[PDB]
Amino acid sequence: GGWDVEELPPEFFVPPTKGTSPTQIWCNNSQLPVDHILAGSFETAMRLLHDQVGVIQFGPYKQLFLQTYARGRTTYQALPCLPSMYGYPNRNWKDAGLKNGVPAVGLKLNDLIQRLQLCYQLTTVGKFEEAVEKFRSILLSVPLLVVDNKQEIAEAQQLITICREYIVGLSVETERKKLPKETLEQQKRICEMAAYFTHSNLQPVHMILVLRTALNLFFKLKNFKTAATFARRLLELGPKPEVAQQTRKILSACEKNPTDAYQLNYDMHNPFDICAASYRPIYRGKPVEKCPLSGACYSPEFKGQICRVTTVTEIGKDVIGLRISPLQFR
Amino acid sequence: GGWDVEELPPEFFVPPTKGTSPTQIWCNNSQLPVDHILAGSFETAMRLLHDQVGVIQFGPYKQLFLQTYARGRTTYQALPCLPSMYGYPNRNWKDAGLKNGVPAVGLKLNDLIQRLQLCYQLTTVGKFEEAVEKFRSILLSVPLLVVDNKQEIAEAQQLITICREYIVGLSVETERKKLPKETLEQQKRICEMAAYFTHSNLQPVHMILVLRTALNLFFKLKNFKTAATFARRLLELGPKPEVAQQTRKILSACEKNPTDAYQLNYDMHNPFDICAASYRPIYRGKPVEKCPLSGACYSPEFKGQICRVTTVTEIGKDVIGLRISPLQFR
Amino acid sequence: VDELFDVKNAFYIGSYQQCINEAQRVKLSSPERDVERDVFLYRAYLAQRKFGVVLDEIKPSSAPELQAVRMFADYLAHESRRDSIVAELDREMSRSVDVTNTTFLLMAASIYLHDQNPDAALRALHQGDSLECTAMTVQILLKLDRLDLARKELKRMQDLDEDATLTQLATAWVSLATGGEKLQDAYYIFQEMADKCSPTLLLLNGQAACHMAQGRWEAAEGLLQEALDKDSGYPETLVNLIVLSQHLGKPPEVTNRYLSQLKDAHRSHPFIKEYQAKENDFDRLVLQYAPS
Amino acid sequence: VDELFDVKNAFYIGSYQQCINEAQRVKLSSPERDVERDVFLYRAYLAQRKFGVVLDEIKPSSAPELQAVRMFADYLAHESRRDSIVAELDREMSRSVDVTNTTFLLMAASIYLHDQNPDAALRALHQGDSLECTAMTVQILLKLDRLDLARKELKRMQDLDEDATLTQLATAWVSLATGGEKLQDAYYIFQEMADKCSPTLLLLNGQAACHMAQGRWEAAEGLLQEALDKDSGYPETLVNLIVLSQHLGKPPEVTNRYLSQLKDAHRSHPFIKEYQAKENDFDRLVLQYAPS
């Protein structure tokens, strides 16, 4: 054969023309929305969010966008009295070169998991409006992650699920508290909502409070057969002693008369999802339209509308799926 | 005075006892490793190689040892049906006697110089791995020579030097071809290695190919000032016409813009040796540890390790020096 | 050896008051050097935004180099006059300029850069032969994202005077734009000038930007806090602190405090205008995906 | 004159089949000579490794000299039996032996040499008085690297019968071990026996070893190629060809072919075992200079 040699050698004052800016290099090398927001390319970032996760109402993103934009580039003076320089810090800075750079990571997944705890505390002390706000911020923040491996993509998706569960649950409870309790029929509706809240997947400390609420309401209704099962599930989560005792007392009173007084719209042995807009159950086989980012379930009347949970997505739009890692572009 | 006479006259069946074997006589009369290997005394041969030329890892010698052992003695039948006899052919057979013999010479210096040509051809056609193997065989074979006069000891040493130059050079090139060319910094490193290869002392036909490689790489880098000198040296070796023309074209293109774009770690006017293990330059005054047999230069971190060139010696060990002739034992 | 070494050194690293102090002490060993000293003195007053000193003291009888400094000062002080000054500058350049008067070319190019005319500024700098002219070209070329051309101009300064303050500084700017291993290089240049002279706001943020480019946010926090203690209004500190805050996981209320503090930086850093522009860009794109 | 001259001659130079052929033709001019002839006949079948002929045809009624040949044949044919045969031989010798039965002493000494017991073999040969006994002593003494003692025993054969085949052969072996001028002597002895009789594998390699000892490798190539053409399995040819190959500069692939060909020589030459032993010696010494 041969070696490593056996190309083409080619053929006033003019001001030079600009090269590509480092933010454009960013947009070229990345399909993740946060990188485009760091670059100042809001429109291509919005395109990515719309196609990947279904955002159409971007208003509630303004804070996240602007603040993200503000962390994108550093600045330093060169010669005195002249406009300052910008620096464009890259996450791959060891080997970015001129053409391959992609911006530093400013929001890490564990920052968000840490904010979860303040959400949980807010919920526990009962500040539902403020917990929902903090939860929604985590939810909308998740598509701005940059994330290394497949397990972190999994965790981020679980995080979105957690924020959703809490948002729809607290939304249900907040609406139940706004409803009148005069009519018997009005009270039946309130109990229904408390029973739906029971089927949210929260942390045991919070599911104990929702079962306590449901147990009280179904006991006043004299639906002792369903109330008894709420009591048994609450006892099985292992509440604090005083609540366990009050609960055992209510349970033996339910079993000394195990009859439900009214037929409510709540199936105990039948899985459903809670319509996040009308707060009625959608039973496991029936038609449902979903939020493409959070997984909020909606009755089909609402397809095309703005998801009550995320507040920025289109119900039922088909989308690529969340993208928050280089992995997802093989 | 007197004559030539003006000593001491001394004072069942027993099986006689053995006399000294002829191979032991060999070991007694010789300090050259090949003679001990021909005798079957592997341990004393290894001692001689270790003390004289610094061998400590003898594994890669197995073939040479065994094959040398196999040529040491002839064999012939005496009486029918009895174990055959051995003959022990001596190089001094005309006057060896019982006590003075020393074995026949089975590897001559010119056999090795002839193998050089197959090494050269292998290199020219680009089969670097196989050329290095053949070169190393010549190198390890040199201490098995038996050699008459001082000029042949000189030639053998030059032969070792040739095998070394080619082994470290081809090693450099083989490693450059294994390196990535993505980053600008990675490309700078590749050019550095090509420029080091330029300072190997090979035959003009081969130095022409290494300068061709370096000229291409430094031209793509836009280091036209150093590339221009590579071109001038290649033209001075007198390449074949087509290469001379392509080179003159690249040279006038370099001189119509004689600027180097990047500072590389390669000093044009400064003699150095190539670290045979890390492939960096060791500039003429700085600390170096060497191979005691080949002359391979190493940066001092590597003293005491196994030389990458010979594959059997201890870097920097102090040794007697190569012994391959009766001359060297006055 | 140059009698004005310490004076120019202090000016270029941003140590303006030390420059002013040392200029008023040096002995008049020429009338060439005399005017050169006065040029740096008034450029240092310019850097402190004390335009009144420059405007009142440089009279129509003052040397041509000082007239160029006062031209620049007139521009910086009087927004209403800027477009007319630029116009007159355009005519001067089209007519005839003393090309050996590098002080004039540097002042003209300064004015052009502020009027957002890098072409005109480079065209003016091209005509001059001095080390600061090359340095200012290196800077403008870096702003134009032409790292290649900047490397060539830097190579010129390196061949002419390796140890010069302007050459070190240009090396650092080129390194900061090159990234990679070269970032550490920039840091030590900045550090070595701080520990020969004095740690100025300019050098503190240079070092800070080197750390932040390597992702070493905690290492940058000390530098930025020191810069914040020296001058609560220097904008580059405020911007860098925004970036650093977010990379240290601090609450959005901190980024908001720095953004509000930047509206009173009373030094004209473009960041707030670009920010408000991106605010308007966002509002408009919101109305594009949902025309309310 | 000896009626069995041609028969013993053919046997000692390795021309076994000619020996067998000529033994079956001679006329029974005695019963002493009759048994002597049968001894050489069966020793020739032994030399051809046709042990079955010897073992089946020599019966317990056969003459004592034949019993000694069959003893040796039993030993060569049956590896499992060797240690017991040697044991019984040890007892026979300790008890009482007919010392005039040289055929028995030669068979006993053969067995001892194969059992690697030169002392016992020499002790047995010492008791006999015959030309082959001396010749076998010359051989064993040469193997013990006692050229001096071999010279004395050879002198005995020379005084008794200068022109005898065994005496010529012993002269050649002594010469080959003496080296120097005497090497040429050995060659002509071997040559003269080849050109009176027939060039056997034994004589071809004798001549070859004389040439190789003088360093005349090209002169040996013809002899060895002729031996290789006669019998592809005779080991001494294979060993000598290894030596010769290397001294003619041929590739290691040739030495390797001869080494692989020697593992199927189906004649028990020790060279391969010594080789594999030196392989093991080398592996162990490698681990001594670098204990991995």
| Calpha distance C89→C87 (Å, rounded) | 5
DSSP structure class, residue A266: -
Residues from chain C that touch B259, judged by Cβ atoms under 8 A, are 152, 155
By CB neighbour count within 10 A (0-12 exposed, 13-18 middle, 19+ buried), where does B238 fall? exposed
Check B259 against C152: CB less than 8 A apart. yes
Check if the beta carbon of residue C65 is closer than 8 Å to that of residue C101: yes
Residue C61: partners with Cβ closer than 8 Å, 6 or more residues away: none
Q: Using alpha carbons only, what angle is made at residue B127 by residues B121 and B133, rounded to the nearest 5 degrees?
A: 90
Between A5, A7, A9, which is nearest B209 by CB?
Answer: A5
Amino acid at position D125, single letter: L
CB-nearest to C181 from B185, B259, B261 is B185
> What are the C-alpha distances in Å from D82 to residues B22, D55, D74, D103, D116?
31, 15, 8, 20, 12
Question: Is the torsion defined by CA of C11, C15, C16, C19 positive or negative?
Answer: negative
Interface residues of B toward A, Cβ cutoff 8 Å, are 125-126, 173, 177, 182-185, 209, 212-213, 216, 220, 249-250, 253
Interface test with C, best of B182, B185, B186, B224 (most C CBs within 10 A): B185
* Strand-pair category, A74-76 with A85-87: antiparallel
Task: Give residue D49's identity as a one-letter amino acid code.
Answer: R
The distance in angstroms from the start CA to the end CA of chain B is 35
User: Vertex A256, ends A255 and A262: CA angle to 5°?
Assistant: 70
Q: Which of C147, C149, C155 to probe the B interface (max B CBs under 10 A)?
A: C155
Distance in angstroms (rounded) separating the CA atoms of residues B279 and B263? 18
Burial class (CB in 10 A: 0-12, 13-18, 19+), A228: buried
Contact B222, B261 (CB under 8 A): yes
Span between the terminal Cα atoms of chain D, in Å = 71
For residue B260, the 8-state DSSP code is B
- Given an 8 Å threshold on Cβ–Cβ distance, is C282 in contact with A75? no
Question: Mind telling me how many Å the CA of A14 is from chain B's nearest CA?
Answer: 18
The amino acid present at B195, given as its one-letter code, is A
Find tokens 């001869």 and name the residue: D258
What six digits make up the tokens of D145? 């690297």
The pair of structure tokens assigned to B190 is 């590749």
Contact C211, A128 (CB under 8 A): no
Residue B249 amino acid letter: K
Q: Which of B20, B36, B38, B33 is nearest to B97 (CA)?
A: B20
Alpha carbons B74 and B55: distance in angstroms, whole number: 30
b or e along D90-114 (b: 16 or more beta carbons within 10 Å of the residue's beta carbon)? eeebeeeeeeebbbbbbbbbbbbbb
H-helix or E-strand spanning residue B180: none
Nearest chain B residue to D14, by CA:
B80
Rounded Cα–Cα distance for residues B302 and B11 (Å):
66
Residues A21/C145, Cβ–Cβ less than 8 Å: yes
Q: Give yes or no for a contact between C181 and C213, defined as CB atoms under 8 angstroms apart.
A: no
- Asked if B touches D (at least 3 Cβ pairs < 8 angstroms), the answer reads yes
Using DSSP, how many helices (H) and how many strands (E) does chain D show? 17, 0
Tokens of B201: 């002392």
The whole-angstrom distance between A73's CA and the closest CA on chain C is: 7
Q: CA of A109: how far to CAs of A116, A157, A260, in Å? A: 11, 11, 47
Structural domains of chain C in order of their starting residue, each with its CATH number:
1-292 (1.25.40.10)
- What are the sequence ranges of the domains in chain B? 1-330
Q: Which residues of B touch D249 (CB under 8 A)?
A: 108, 111
Q: Which residues of B touch D212 (CB under 8 A)?
A: 74, 87, 89
| One-letter identity of residue A157 | Q
| Contacts with D76 from chain B: Cβ below 8 Å | 81
Name all contacts of C134-140 with Cβ < 8 Å and 24+ positions apart.
Answer: C134/C166, C134/C170, C135/A79, C135/C166, C135/C167, C135/C169, C135/C170, C136/A79, C136/A82, C136/C106, C136/C109, C138/C170, C138/C173, C138/C174, C139/A78, C139/A79, C139/A82, C139/A85, C139/C170, C139/C173, C140/C109, C140/C113
SS (H, E, C) A277-314: CCCCEEECCCCCEECCCCCCEECHHHCCCECCCCCCEE
The Cα–Cα gap between B61 and B66 comes to: 9
Structure tokens given for B238: 């007198």
**Inter-chain contact B183–A7, Cβ cutoff 8 Å?**
no
Asked if residue A37 lies in contact with residue A61, where contact means CB atoms within 8 angstroms, the answer is: no
Cβ(A45)–Cβ(A36) under 8 Å? yes
Inter-chain CB pairs, A–C, below 8 Å: 176
D199 — contact with chain B (CB < 8 Å)?
no
CB B322 within 8 A of CB B157: yes
Contact B16 D209 (CB under 8 A): no
d(CA B271, CA B168): 16
Q: Is D26 exposed, middle or buried (0-12, 13-18, 19+ CB in 10 A)?
A: middle
Resolution in A: 3.1
Q: Specify the 3-state DSSP secondary structure of B273.
A: strand
Query: How far, in Å, CA of D254 to CA of B111, rounded?
Result: 16
Please give the structure tokens belonging to residue B7: 């000593």
Q: What sign has the CA pseudo-torsion A164, A168, A173, A175?
A: positive
Q: Chain B: residue nearest C148 by CA?
A: B261
Contacts 24+ apart (CB under 8 A), D257-264: D259/B70, D261/D232, D262/D235, D262/D238, D264/D233
Residue B190 CA to residue B24 CA, distance in Å, equals 55
Check if A117 contacts C (Cβ < 8 Å): no
Phi-psi bin for A180: left (phi > 0), alpha (psi -120 to 50), beta? Answer: beta
Q: Pick from B15, B70, B81: which is nearest to D275 by CB? A: B70
Distance CA D123, CA D120 (A): 5
**3-state DSSP helix/strand/coil percent for chain B, to nearest 5?**
50, 5, 40
Q: How far apart are alpha carbons A77 and A87 in whole angstroms?
A: 11
Asked whether the beta carbons of residue C152 and residue B185 sit closer than 8 angstroms, the reply is: no
Beta bridge partners of A289: A298
Interface test with C, best of A75, A112, A114, A144 (most C CBs within 10 A): A75
Residue with token string 């002279």: C197
List chain B residues with CB under 8 Å of C180: 183, 185
Angle between helix axes C82-95 and C118-126 (nearest 10 degrees) is 40
Between C122, C179, C243, which is nearest A15 by CB? C122
- Contact between chains at D246 and B76 (C-beta distance less than 8 A): no
Do C and B touch, 3+ Cβ pairs within 8 Å? The answer is: yes
* C-alpha separations of A164 from A122, A142, A167, A171, A274 in Å: 16, 12, 5, 10, 11
Chain B residues lying within 8 Å of D239, measured CB to CB = 74-75
What's the rounded Cα separation, in Å, for the pair C33 and C39? 10
Contact A322, A157 (CB under 8 A): yes
C111: nearest CA in chain A?
Answer: A82
Residues in D closer than 8 angstroms to B89, CB to CB, are 212-213, 215, 243
Q: Which of B113, B311, B47 is nearest to B37 (CA)?
A: B47
Cβ atoms of residues D173 and B46 within 8 Å: no
Distance CA A28, CA A23 (A): 9
Contact A39, A72 (CB under 8 A): yes
| Residue D183: exposure state from Cβ atoms within 10 A (0-12, 13-18, ≥19) | buried
> In the PDB record, what is the listed experimental method?
X-ray
Q: Does D251 touch chain B (CB under 8 A)?
A: no
Residues from chain A that touch B220, judged by Cβ atoms under 8 A, are 7
d(CA B299, CA B294): 15
Q: Are B83 and B321 in contact (CB under 8 A)?
A: no
Interface partners of chain D (CB pairs < 8 Å, 3 or more) are B
How is residue B300 annotated by DSSP? G
Using alpha carbons only, how large is chain B's radius of gyration in Å?
27
Spatial contact of B276 and B316, defined as CB atoms under 8 Å apart: no
Q: How far apart are CA C281 and CA C260, in angstroms?
A: 20
- Using a CB–CB cutoff of 8 Å, tell me whether D107 touches chain B: no
Contacts of B45 (CB under 8 A, 6+ apart): B33, B34, B36, B37, B65
Give the DSSP H/E element, type plus range, for residue B275: none
Question: After which residues does chain B have a break in its backbone, defined as C to next N over 2.5 Å?
Answer: 6, 11
